[PDB]
Design an enzyme around this catalytic site. Structure first.
Site, PDB file in Angstrom:
ATOM      1  N   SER A   1       0.718  -1.106  -0.061  1.00  0.00           N
ATOM      2  CA  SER A   1      -0.070   0.172  -0.049  1.00  0.00           C
ATOM      3  C   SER A   1       0.940   1.334   0.093  1.00  0.00           C
ATOM      4  O   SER A   1       0.362   2.354   0.189  1.00  0.00           O
ATOM      5  CB  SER A   1      -0.936  -0.237   1.378  1.00  0.00           C
ATOM      6  OG  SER A   1      -2.047  -1.004   1.336  1.00  0.00           O
ATOM      7  N   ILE A   2       2.145   1.117  -0.323  1.00  0.00           N
ATOM      8  CA  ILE A   2       2.941   2.132  -0.330  1.00  0.00           C
ATOM      9  C   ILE A   2       2.621   3.213  -1.564  1.00  0.00           C
ATOM     10  O   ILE A   2       2.644   2.528  -2.951  1.00  0.00           O
ATOM     11  CB  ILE A   2       4.367   1.834  -0.370  1.00  0.00           C
ATOM     12  CG1 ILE A   2       4.798   1.231   0.887  1.00  0.00           C
ATOM     13  CG2 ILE A   2       5.503   3.076  -0.610  1.00  0.00           C
ATOM     14  CD1 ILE A   2       5.919   0.458   0.731  1.00  0.00           C
ATOM     15  N   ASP A   3       2.261   4.434  -1.451  1.00  0.00           N
ATOM     16  CA  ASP A   3       1.934   5.219  -2.444  1.00  0.00           C
ATOM     17  C   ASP A   3       3.251   6.084  -2.862  1.00  0.00           C
ATOM     18  O   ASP A   3       3.948   6.887  -2.257  1.00  0.00           O
ATOM     19  CB  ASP A   3       0.723   6.190  -2.195  1.00  0.00           C
ATOM     20  CG  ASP A   3      -0.554   5.653  -2.165  1.00  0.00           C
ATOM     21  OD1 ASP A   3      -0.714   4.606  -2.697  1.00  0.00           O
ATOM     22  OD2 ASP A   3      -1.294   6.106  -1.266  1.00  0.00           O
ATOM     23  N   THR A   4       3.863   5.620  -4.288  1.00  0.00           N
ATOM     24  CA  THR A   4       5.086   6.475  -4.642  1.00  0.00           C
ATOM     25  C   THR A   4       4.819   7.924  -5.165  1.00  0.00           C
ATOM     26  O   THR A   4       5.693   8.493  -5.922  1.00  0.00           O
ATOM     27  CB  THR A   4       5.774   5.510  -5.688  1.00  0.00           C
ATOM     28  OG1 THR A   4       4.738   5.227  -6.770  1.00  0.00           O
ATOM     29  CG2 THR A   4       6.027   4.339  -5.041  1.00  0.00           C
ATOM     30  N   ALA A   5       3.376   8.080  -5.615  1.00  0.00           N
ATOM     31  CA  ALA A   5       3.080   9.486  -6.166  1.00  0.00           C
ATOM     32  C   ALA A   5       3.388  10.636  -5.389  1.00  0.00           C
ATOM     33  O   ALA A   5       3.536  11.730  -5.845  1.00  0.00           O
ATOM     34  CB  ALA A   5       1.480   9.437  -6.396  1.00  0.00           C
TER      35      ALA A   5
END
Ligand SMILES: Nc1ncnc2c1ncn2[C@@H]1O[C@H](COP(=O)(O)OP(=O)(O)OP(=O)(O)O)[C@@H](O)[C@H]1O
Ligand SMILES: [Zn+2]
Lengths: 303, 81, 225
Positions: free
Chosen positions: C167-171
């Site tokens: 669930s890591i958001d790289t945006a």
């Protein structure tokens, strides 16, 4: 022991995912009951077809053959391993004889090259036996690293099962068929609904009159705990444990263990951890954590 | 990605018990139709016995997440990559 | 190098989607700059505010802390959550230290020790979601380094299997990025806010633009450019 009444009629379905409406109503476009001579004539008449096998009524008749689907020395060891694995259950509670089982399963099989299907000609049982040990077969496949055992599919064992007939394509679009393997030629050597008795085969089932009520209690069979795993649990804690005197798998999780501290904590760096510790089991994994406020300690996992 | 058949095979491998709605699953409506499990044996995620609600699948970050309708604490969450 | 230069002023936007022209002229009704105590008091008097944290000038001072956002649509029990957070911390530290040693020229042990030394977490009032922002207090790097690390973080999220790691958001690693302040509303008519954790009681530990390097901190940046 039905014995007398012989099953030579083959129940065939002509559509995967057939609607449940026109399935039990004997629709000629979805359901047929053929015999040995008519099947090849039907295959010749219709160049393109999709035919799956099934049983008439699982409630009345549920006598089938043991079969596997996988997707010379390798299969030679695979057959022996499978025979031993099923004979373990046969001698476990079936009331059968191991020698008869191994004699029946010896050198009597068929092969099919498309992912190959094995059917044993002289082995007859009832489908509840197949539904009972899908998990046992999966455990055997997972524990071992044998070449052909690694890709055994246990999803084929179910109610209202379907087995693709040799020479019948899954869809007209696909161009994959089952090529028959020697020395078997007749279709009757590849029918898992075919039943016979040739004064050499053997029949086995639960034989103790259970209506799929075999699972009574699965008490988390990690009871090798005698001194292997529980000593590991006592090894991570350097300080002495007082409740270790008497432990059992029945009270394995319910008892809150209380330890004593003379040196600082092992899992963390605290003092005496006043709230007692606790233990749990999940997915075959031993878990250790502190009751009360779990954030004041660290959860440790032991395989 | 991988073929839909392989993903369905992995999902059916995760669930020890069979699925009575397998034929209804397709490549376009595999996230909306609930799945019913023939509970003859306890489900592998949480032991308990014979859940009374269907399951469901979601697609996120190239993975399939299995979640049970109703109370979330009943059944553990499972992710198939 | 930076030496004396240690940022303590907090630059804040009071409205999402701020006009581009207003920002260049420092429009008072969309742009503000406080200290820690001033920001705390401003939040205290007005609990209905909506505040986002961002930098002002990326070409002069571009030193920020390491931050990550995790958002999963699934509730979890206490022990499973603790195990997941431990595994997430370990894997993230390993990946970041590996990148720092490979492309930045730093030391693996120092980076991993600094990251595991101190870290702050948040929580959401939602009863069906697990969402939190994690900020590493004693590790410092430039924004472009995080932009480069975006690919490695995406690969790690794709490869892993823990519910929290997927669930890591790289945006969030983009030019002119913004982050929501804890305890502050997101939508004008939404009651879901973020809360602190018992180890940390000050807002100074929940802002990624606050820089104060003590004897225990580590700093690294890209060297190829
Ligand atoms: N209820 C079910 N009925 C049929 N298949 C199921 C069911 N649940 C899960 N499955 C899985 O879905 C797969 C799809 O079946 P399919 O006939 O396409 O397989 P296949 O690999 O082509 O088999 P075969 O070698 O028998 O031709 C099955 O092999 C099985 O693993
Ligand atoms: Zn469950």
């Amino acid at each position: 022991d039905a014995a007398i009444r012989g099953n030579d009629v083959i129940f065939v379905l002509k559509t995967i995912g057939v609607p449940s409406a026109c399935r039990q109503n004997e629709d000629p476009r979805f359901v047929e009951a053929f015999k040995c001579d008519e099947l090849e004539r039907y295959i010749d008449n219709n160049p393109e077809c999709t035919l799956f096998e099934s049983l008439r009524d699982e409630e009345a008749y549920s006598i089938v053959r043991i079969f596997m689907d996988v997707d010379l020395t390798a299969i030679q060891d695979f057959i022996i391993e499978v025979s031993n694995c099923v004979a373990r259950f046969a001698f476990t509670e079936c009331g059968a004889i191991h020698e008869n089982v191994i004699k029946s399963m010896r050198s009597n099989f068929s092969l099919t090259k498309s992912s190959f299907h094995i059917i044993f000609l002289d082995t007859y049982t009832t489908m509840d036996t197949l539904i009972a040990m899908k998990r046992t077969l999966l455990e055997l496949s997972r524990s071992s690293e044998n070449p052909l055992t690694r890709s055994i599919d246990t999803a084929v064992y179910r109610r209202k099962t379907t087995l693709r007939v040799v020479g019948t394509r899954k869809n007209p679009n696909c161009d994959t068929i089952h090529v028959m393997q020697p020395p078997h030629d007749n279709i009757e050597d590849y029918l898992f609904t075919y039943v016979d008795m040739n004064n050499n085969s053997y029949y086995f089932s639960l034989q103790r009159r259970l209506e799929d009520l075999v699972p009574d209690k699965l008490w988390e069979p990690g009871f090798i705990s005698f001194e292997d795993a529980i000593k590991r649990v006592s090894k991570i804690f350097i300080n002495s444990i007082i409740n270790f005197n008497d432990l059992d798998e029945n009270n394995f999780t319910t008892v809150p263990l209380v330890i004593d501290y003379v040196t600082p904590c092992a899992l963390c760096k605290k003092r005496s951890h006043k709230h007692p510790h606790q233990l749990s089991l999940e997915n075959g994994a031993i878990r250790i954590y502190k009751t009360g406020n779990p954030h004041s300690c660290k959860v440790k996992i032991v395989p």
